[PDB]
């Protein structure tokens, strides 16, 4: 008769008040938290948040519930009866959205042990805020957090602490479409301070390194191929007008359809992303490679025997300068965005 | 037994009626309001609103709840019992939608003190309407508000008032993907006047300043360069049929593959914006420079000396007209939108 | 004790029943409606609906709630006990979805007066269906409505009625991203006749004038410019292959990149809009101008005396005919879609 | 006091049990169903479904509720008391999600008549699944159904039935952005069979005919025009002919990628897709045809320029002939 | 009076308690599950999941509910009274989202038979995280699962089992916009092991092959035709500048518009797909054919020497890469 033994511990004749905490008069209650992340995803930068599906598990002691007389060494309080026992008011500080699960039954479990220790396993969906900076897109790396805090109880009455062993665990094979969730999860404190008191808070931080593979092959490399076709105009005489104009116009026009083609499938933000610079710089090196040939024609238009040497002087310079100047920019870009 | 002493104040024996307000006979209830914004964003012109996540603290006095004999200086009421006390009918006048949070327990707190003061903290999500004007895009600024009004109670019975120090606070590091949330939050009244009565209302106003970075680098700067290349056609003589046509075709064609490219990420509004003008004006100047050469070539079609003077005049005029015409427009443009 | 006096009118020893309507014996209950519109937007051609946030104020007489003995001249029933009083089965006929607002408290009010009148104010979100025809887009106009109907009472027992003074009001400074909301609101009856009886229904019509600007500057104008550039090829001699060909190519290619450029931002429907004609006609005029050169070159190919005369005669007509034809089309078009 | 006379028929002393059906021992309960569609829309092939807004109206007989002593010849059960009377366990078999409506009051009605008939009108939003095949897009036509089945009662205890006169009506002036809802709906029976019994089920079938107008004017016709300029290019004019061949290919490839953004998301081939791929050949091969001419006429002699006159003369009456053969095939297949 | 007999079995006087399981003293409760699927859909790499619609059916034995005295040999408990009977604490381990149905009545059914057997059928909407690798688009294949685990009960007290006959059925006619539901579903155990115990879990594997039709006609073939135009320029002599220059420029400019025309109808992932390699390889082959002519014009014996090689090598080198490609992405 375990269900029956419980309402002797919880009921009218027991004298249990779930509105009152354990050790009411004396020291604080110690709640040992740990989670399991079964699902991690929907990281959006427009709403600046991410969704996670977890099992939260709180463990604590309530000496009001300790027993001995009964043979079975642990009792399972029914989900519907959960009001009838005190439990901590842990909430997620940075939660935007939240809900419990109730299919097929309530996804909640409570075990009170013989020594009074309680075990509370509960399954949640959680939308949490993660302020995001795309400055270095697409070589950026984000840091999302998750704060377990007490709502009304202070440090004088309630204290949260992580598990010593694997407090935060993540399901095997979980994938994100754009980031990689890293294996390191930094645990730390966030104990808040207000003029209304001091409140317990424990934190876990996830790290999210973005992937480039797509932008590398479908944007950086093709733009590099076009900037290489900009330089071959230099290795032709001034007399061949059709080639150097057509190439220059192609190179410019092709680079322009590429920089516009990309824009529709990039994160829509107001500030300058690292990718936005690459497109701009690549446009100069295509633009000026056409503007170079215009400067050659303006000097070598007057077909004097002397200045054709000094006009071909521009071309001999550019043959070494444009490849070098590009490589000086290139070496800056990848060193800065892979420091 | 603080929870038991509490329901001596609330219970049938007390004679407390939660439908009735404090000081029901005479003067109005003074309610002191303040908020902490933990999340700000989802600012959308499409639905013309924004989304916030807040704490809302409310402090008033109830002389019925005051007590003395009991030791503990403040009693807190359970979140399941809130309806047994009176509380103010505060609602957000420009709420498109709202709700509470109840994970893991109800995110609500109430403290009633020995003196009779009641402190009521509530966590909330609100979607509030923010009528927006994008006439000056992307050099616009917006002003989203937030009104705390009383529903049923008039000025005679209820008054809402902000805190003196730091009434409306905002969490650290809350980035937005487009706007910048300014430090200045203005505080005023919105007391409503209907035939049915006067109604207390307080208001806090935010200021949002849109960033340009991306549009400056992907639109303005690139377009500026394509318009200058349009002018160099003037500096070539009439004989160079390939060059002058090649530039005119490239410039227009390149200007067009930028305008279509930029449309992708423009805000969804069916009216004219600052950005749209610029793009249309830059089209005219690129189009008409090619149209000018058509008028030059048409005049010198007649190969006599009278007409070659007429056609030589057009270019030499155009060399110092287009750059003046542009500058005069450019001066207007940037002066108007950065007044 | 105004709370206590109410439940003397409603409670056990009163004999009042909420299920029964006022004047149950004979004549119908005249309900007086009026709304205030705080929010208006989310107009979609995909879901073919719109979203409004409103107050709704119903007013009727219940002689059963008449009193005098009690000092105060009006009582307010609590939002929780609205079930204990009769109120009209008013529902919105074209509602797709709707909700009450209950933050921070239930956003409802109900006064019962000394003479037995009622005043029921209620805040509501409504998604209403609005069939929309985009045949003339973007020079179209839509007329969304809003019907207040009784669910189960006929005109014999229940009649709805608008107010005489400002029965429908819209908040100051609301804005829509695509449409303009006109100040005129047509009021009328929608009384429904079924085989089960005749039911009360009252309707308010809003009219929406779609905004043009963006499509004018970003699509109509550029398309016009590209048509003008098609005509400049008539002002070069038949000889110049590079120019006359390259113009025709640019114009046709450029024109096409815009029609598809616009597609991504147009309201996605399967039928022909007015803008879709424009782009298609503009395509003909650009295509046929290139086609005209092909005929000219086709004729004068056999370069004798008679052929080059008849070939040159085409271009001379084309300089007049094409702009004339376009102007005739253009006058018809804009006169038809702005009759 | 009609309210009070009702709870005389329902209350403790009446011996009414809402959990037990009418005609409990004997014959099957006959329920006549009919719907009024106020909204029909949100038809998506991504989630593969559509969204309706309807008035369901169920009529059955309950001899336990028949009366006579009361003057009023029909009694209205309040929506709050709906638990207190037996009513059918109707459910929409192909519903992905539904809900009720409750603004301002509960959007429900019940009427029990003097003779025992019950009349239960209710208001719903349904999201019904509609499998959708886009092989012939945009010349396709879809069929979306709606099944009203009994959850737990079998053919022996419960049978569903459409009204004889106009059981499924649709509201005046309802527009869809892509489809046209056809006037003729069909009615039939979906009566299900399992090991656990035979369950009544009635069904209505809507037909949805997609519109082409837009795709005709801004896609099909243009592609026909560029295919014409592939034929006008039909020796010496090297800058012109090759430019006409090149332009067609450029202007075609911009039209192909131009549409892709607007088209529906499906990984299989559509009719629209074939057209563009076919029209890409007829343009691509026109330029490819002149590369055979320029390869043969490159050797400037008597026999080479005569052989290079044979190619352009055939293509003036072969490409138009070949296209027209394919064209007639295409349109006759996608409009039988 | 079957409704009045039930609350004799369940009610106060019986001493039945739904908080306690059948065979509480000793051996496990054997539940036998099975599902009908009326909707597999909303597969989404962005959220990394699909939303399914099902009937679930659980059958077990409860000897506290056995009877014989009553004539009718099976009783139907009302959906409203489902609290007052024990039933398994089944949950889907890989649910992100799920819900019951309430229209028009509660879509649930419970029969208790003469021999204490309970038969519980319930209608549900789920959403099940399906981690998808997309590295071989659009020749990829994806194995979505669905786990039915016991929340609180171990293997000592509760065991799930699929039906022996047609445990997982799928409704006729269903279609997907991008994939196929492969006929063969797998079944297996997932039984979880923890430090708190060993929990019963049964699972079904749906396989889904993605379709290539759209990308074949609108991408792979048009990319091939452009690469064929890259080879015709070789056959032209070194003299013809406009012809060979116009080809390369057309070939490049055409290949750029297709490769950007695809971007719109590709899935939202940051990593390299197989489609991307093909687009990037078909750039090189166009790009280099133009770059070859630059070496020919930058160099009459050696200038005509390069053209004769690239008529054979480029169609071959392509064919060599191509063979690897389709063999690696169709092993
Ligand atoms: C419900 O419908 C069935 C079928 O129409 C009815 O059963 C018939 O009853 C008539 C007389 O009422 C007989 O003549 C037929 O032979 C019956 N046919 C069948 C197939 O049963 C039934 O009576 C109807 N009404 C109820 C149950 O009240
Ligand atoms: C439920 O399932 C298992 C396997 O069918 C049964 O387990 C057997 O239980 C009996 C009686 O306690 C033991 O003697 C056997 O050794 C068990 N065999 C096993 C585990 O392989 C169980 O009895 C079944 N039915 C019940 C408990 O009603
Ligand atoms: O009076 C307050 C306002 C302040 O609001 C910001 C959020 C806070 C987080 N928790 C939520 C409830 C609160 C609290 C607890 C006990 C008495 C007063 C009280 N609050 C908030 C407070 C902080 C700290 C604490
Ligand atoms: O009679 C009214 C209608 C009017 O509706 C718009 C909104 C208003 C804001 N609050 C909400 C309830 C209301 C009010 C209070 C007491 C008696 C009548 C009454 N109302 C609304 C009124 C205003 C003012 C007030
Ligand atoms: O019998 C009916 C069905 C019919 O269905 C379409 C909608 C209607 C709108 N209201 C809702 C309830 C209804 C009504 C009132 C009283 C008795 C029967 C009854 N109904 C519906 C009816 C119409 C009219 C009315
Ligand atoms: O045992 C079952 C499983 C089967 O599942 C598919 C759907 C069905 C539709 N309704 C829902 C409940 C059901 C039923 C009724 C009475 C006893 C058992 C039972 N069910 C399901 C059944 C079919 C038929 C019926
Ligand atoms: O203590 C725990 C935490 C752990 O959480 C991950 C999920 C699990 C699946 N079910 C859910 C409840 C749980 C369980 C049952 C009985 C005592 C403790 C307990 N739990 C979770 C546990 C595993 C196993 C089991
Ligand atoms: C709980 O909290 C602290 C930290 O370990 C400690 O002082 C105290 O003894 C702990 N144990 C209790 C209250 O039982
Ligand atoms: C509340 O404020 C008003 C005005 O500030 C004042 O008249 C009143 O006395 C104050 N205090 C109360 C009503 O307790
Ligand atoms: C309601 O209006 C009707 C129509 O004018 C009138 O006949 C009736 O007397 C009015 N008042 C009632 C029924 O109380």
XYZ file of N, CA and C and ligand atoms in Angstrom, chain B residues 91 149-154 192 194 196-197 199, chain C residues 34 36 38 55-57 108-109 111 119-122, ligand 4:
100
model
N -3.238 46.666 -17.505
C -3.054 46.014 -18.791
C -2.251 46.922 -19.718
N -1.854 50.976 -18.614
C -3.150 51.616 -18.367
C -3.972 50.788 -17.380
N -4.942 51.440 -16.737
C -5.941 50.763 -15.909
C -7.202 50.505 -16.727
N -7.759 49.308 -16.571
C -8.885 48.863 -17.383
C -10.210 49.466 -16.906
N -10.644 49.079 -15.708
C -11.945 49.477 -15.167
C -11.907 50.664 -14.220
N -10.884 50.725 -13.371
C -10.773 51.791 -12.370
C -10.378 53.133 -12.990
N -11.055 54.192 -12.549
C -10.796 55.550 -13.026
C -9.666 56.197 -12.223
N -6.188 58.714 -20.353
C -7.169 58.614 -21.421
C -8.462 59.320 -21.023
N -12.306 59.274 -22.049
C -13.519 58.796 -22.707
C -14.714 59.425 -22.021
N -16.962 57.840 -20.673
C -17.163 56.975 -19.512
C -16.262 57.326 -18.323
N -15.184 58.074 -18.567
C -14.334 58.571 -17.481
C -12.882 58.823 -17.851
N -8.880 57.846 -17.045
C -8.214 56.588 -16.672
C -6.697 56.723 -16.606
N -20.591 48.858 -30.425
C -19.626 49.784 -30.989
C -18.238 49.272 -30.664
N -13.765 49.880 -30.905
C -12.603 50.738 -31.093
C -11.467 49.854 -31.593
N -7.697 49.321 -32.073
C -6.352 49.700 -31.639
C -5.296 49.264 -32.635
N -11.612 46.749 -29.030
C -12.542 46.719 -27.925
C -13.925 46.560 -28.543
N -14.799 45.845 -27.844
C -16.173 45.638 -28.280
C -17.091 45.961 -27.106
N -18.028 46.878 -27.319
C -18.853 47.398 -26.233
C -20.334 47.120 -26.498
N -11.952 42.270 -19.016
C -13.399 42.325 -19.187
C -14.026 43.224 -18.121
N -15.112 43.887 -18.495
C -15.860 44.710 -17.569
C -17.345 44.574 -17.854
N -20.941 46.447 -16.258
C -21.752 47.235 -15.342
C -23.215 46.884 -15.527
N -23.656 47.220 -19.526
C -22.528 47.750 -20.296
C -21.354 46.766 -20.255
N -21.173 46.030 -21.354
C -20.219 44.913 -21.429
C -19.072 45.220 -22.403
N -17.921 45.616 -21.859
C -16.739 45.936 -22.664
C -15.720 44.803 -22.591
N -15.125 44.485 -23.730
C -14.350 43.263 -23.872
C -13.268 43.461 -24.928
O -17.688 51.741 -22.018
C -16.491 51.543 -22.224
C -15.955 51.524 -23.672
C -14.475 52.050 -23.808
O -13.775 51.014 -24.546
C -12.411 51.335 -24.868
C -11.457 51.104 -23.900
C -11.481 51.789 -22.706
C -10.383 51.401 -21.721
N -11.005 51.015 -20.436
C -11.492 49.629 -20.603
C -12.899 49.570 -20.020
C -13.429 50.982 -20.208
C -14.486 51.243 -19.139
C -14.390 51.311 -17.751
C -15.527 51.554 -16.986
C -16.764 51.716 -17.605
C -16.863 51.641 -18.989
C -15.734 51.384 -19.764
N -15.600 51.303 -21.159
C -14.198 51.129 -21.532
C -13.919 52.352 -22.396
C -12.480 52.844 -22.300
C -12.206 53.165 -20.843
C -12.167 51.861 -20.037
